[PDB]
Design a protein around this ligand. Structure first.
Ligand code: 5X9
Ligand code: CL
Length: 289
């Protein structure tokens, strides 16, 4: 059985929580805390290991953007440090291609990154690759057909409807069709042949709208909106369904988890996180121990 892991996030300050939700039975487990609290981080999995990438420790004692990569082994319930990235990356996006982790965009103070770098677990090494054509923080990232997509975000001046694609064998970024909606701090993931962008912030309002990019047709289409408006949501895919976790609706730090069924085109309430939070990192792997 596979669990949805939620790492870090933010309520009043950055959080070190790691909890796992089991869609088979509705249960949550609290597991080993992150060594350093962090929000605006991303989660991913490689070789059954869970990686926590970037973010920022918002704390009474000071605010520190994170260049960290940390690894969680469900067998041991332990976090281990890995090599750090070239630069701190708050409000990061991440994607995995052929066992390598791409860290995309994010901020370091008022620096809004276009830079992109790639982690090789077998060497414990990061290396920079071609930078994006756009500076993007709060960027959505997904992998489809071993191509890496950077969707939306904030460029230091505007929230973006734009999106682009990285072609590894050419070390080259190219723009794709822009989204119909400006989305910064959205949830972005892949399901079947489409990149989904759920929620985010458009410069005025947190969004409940959801749209998907079909690579074969190069168009974005709206699907059913989520029940909750949300920015800074976590998102993942588990057994052919999209799950969205937490975020911010202009009023509340949400504990809502919703899931999307693409065949009925419907969203439904699935569970509540143990406490409301925004800016989490999420991924799916095997259950611990
Ligand atoms: C309200 N609060 C501060 C938190 O809940 C929060 C706390 C810690 C980390 C994040 C976070 C995580 C990922 C992306 C972004 N992000 N990246 C870019 C922009 C933008 O604003 O363009 C944003 C923020 C989410 C959107 C936002 C802004 N507003 C007013 N609502 N949502 C933030 C949000
Ligand atoms: Cl922040």
């Amino acid at each position: 059985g596979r669990l949805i892991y939620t790492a870090g996030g933010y309520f009043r300050q950055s959080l070190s929580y790691l909890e796992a939700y089991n869609p088979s039975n509705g249960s949550w487990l609290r597991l080993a805390d992150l060594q350093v609290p962090r929000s605006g981080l991303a989660g991913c999995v490689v070789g059954g290991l869970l990686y926590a990438v970037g973010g920022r420790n918002n704390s009474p004692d000071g605010n520190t953007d994170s260049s960290a990569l940390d690894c969680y082994n469900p067998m041991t319930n332990q976090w281990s440090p890995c090599a750090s990235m070239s630069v701190p990356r708050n409000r990061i996006g991440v994607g995995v291609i052929d066992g390598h982790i791409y860290a995309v965009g994010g901020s370091h103070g008022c620096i809004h990154h276009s830079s992109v770098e790639r982690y090789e677990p077998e060497r414990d090494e990061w290396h920079l690759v071609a930078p994006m054509l756009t500076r993007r923080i709060g960027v959505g990232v997904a992998v489809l057909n071993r191509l890496l997509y950077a969707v939306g975000g904030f460029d230091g001046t505007n929230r973006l409807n734009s999106a682009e694609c990285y072609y590894p064998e050419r070390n080259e970024w190219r723009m794709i069709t822009p989204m119909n909606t400006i989305r910064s701090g959205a949830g972005v993931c892949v399901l079947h042949n489409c990149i989904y962008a759920a929620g985010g912030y458009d410069g005025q309002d947190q969004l409940n709208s959801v749209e998907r990019y079909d690579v074969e047709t190069e168009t974005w289409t709206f699907v059913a909106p989520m029940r909750h408006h949300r920015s800074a949501l976590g998102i993942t895919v588990h057994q052919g369904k999209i799950y969205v976790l937490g975020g911010y609706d202009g009023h509340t730090f949400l504990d809502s988890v919703e899931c999307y069924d693409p065949d009925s085109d419907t969203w439904s309430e699935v569970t509540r996180m143990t406490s409301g939070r925004s800016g989490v990192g999420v991924a799916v792997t095997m259950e611990p121990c």
